[PDB]
Design a protein around this ligand. Structure first.
Ligand SMILES: Cc1cc(O)c2c(c1)C(=O)c1cc(O)cc(O)c1C2=O
Length: 329
């Protein structure tokens, strides 16, 4: 029992050719056009390398999918094609065929990539507001286009601290939102899983990405990543319940008349709420501001419907200075 408080009819008002990724036909490119130049990472069921080009001869990114169903490949490509152009979203340049074995390869643009395991700890109070903001612009866009990312995490938020640039990547788990549809809950990463996924409220929506965002943010301001250090889907809910309090979860479970399975309810037991301020400590005092906490507090709400929307969040007084810089440039 749930609907999206915003952009719900986006796909209901658009041409079937928009969200029906199955009825797609890939206009592959020439493998010859691209050559691997240096591996650079991993992207969940996909190896990634820094490559070159067709005739431009410029840096790019080659993501050789890990042979999954033809189904998910159309999905990722389609969604990327719909989001091509939006603020801070990764732009797809090509979609060649399998040079080697079993899969095709997506060609993007060079993202000078930097590390959140070393970057984040150096970020200043203002650098955060700035990037979370830029990320928000990216989320409000895909959401405005009826698409949920479903895998927001530090890793899929590549920042170029030098160019002050940010890009949202890996839309391999992304999906089109349709009113009242029940999606699978085996999405995103555990530490950023919204409670909905953990109680099995399948008719979720864009608001899922906002919870994940909240998890990143928290790990940023409190300097404790991951913030919800769960050891498995069940312990993820407990690790959360131990912070937000079980009272909140009970109200949540009733509202959506969802019954928590045995073995899960016991493992969650009953815990009081923990004031955000109790996570403050030396290493994170220069970032934990009343405004930050308030913003964080409005992102991490059991009830997905209670969470802020990408658009609402960008107007929060917390980002007030970041905004006051674009209306001046
Ligand atoms: C869909 C998608 C688009 C991308 O542009 C990247 C990735 C995925 C990705 O997984 C990735 C991993 C990495 O370690 C470095 C990157 O620059 C990347 C990427 O740039």
């Amino acid at each position: 029992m749930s609907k999206a408080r915003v952009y719900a009819d986006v796909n209901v008002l658009r041409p079937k050719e928009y969200w029906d990724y199955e009825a797609l036909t890939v206009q592959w490119g020439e493998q010859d056009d691209y050559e691997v130049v240096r591996k650079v990472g991993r992207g969940k069921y996909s190896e990634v390398f820094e490559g070159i080009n067709v005739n431009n001869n410029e840096k790019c990114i080659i993501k050789i999918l890990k042979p999954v169903k033809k189904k998910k490949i159309k999905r990722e490509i389609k969604i990327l094609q719909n989001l091509c152009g939006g603020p801070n979203i990764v732009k797809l340049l090509d979609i060649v065929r399998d040079q080697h074995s079993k899969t095709p390869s997506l060609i993007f643009e060079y993202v000078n990539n930097t590390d959140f395991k070393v970057l984040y700890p150096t970020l200043t109070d203002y650098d955060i507001r700035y990037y979370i903001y830029e990320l928000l612009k990216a989320l409000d866009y895909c959401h405005s286009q009826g698409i949920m990312h479903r895998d927001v995490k530090p890793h899929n938020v590549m920042i170029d601290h030098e160019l002050r640039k940010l890009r949202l990547i890996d839309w391999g788990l992304a999906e089109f939102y349709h009113p009242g549809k029940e999606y699978n809950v085996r999405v995103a990463s555990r530490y950023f899983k919204g409670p909905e996924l953990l109680v099995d409220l399948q008719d979720y929506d864009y608001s899922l990405d906002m919870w994940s965002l909240g998890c990143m943010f928290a790990g940023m301001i409190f300097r404790k990543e991951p913030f919800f250090y769960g050891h498995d889907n069940h312990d993820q809910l407990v690790k959360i319940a131990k912070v937000l309090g079980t009272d909140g979860l009970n109200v949540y479970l009733n509202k959506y008349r969802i019954e928590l399975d045995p073995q899960l309810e016991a493992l969650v037991g009953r815990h009081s709420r923990k004031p955000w301020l109790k996570f403050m400590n030396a290493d994170n005092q220069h970032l934990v501001s009343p405004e930050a906490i308030d913003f964080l507090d409005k992102l991490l709400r059991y009830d997905h419907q209670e969470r802020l929307t990408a658009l609402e969040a960008m107007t929060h007084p917390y980002f007030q200075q970041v905004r006051a810089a674009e209306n001046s440039r």
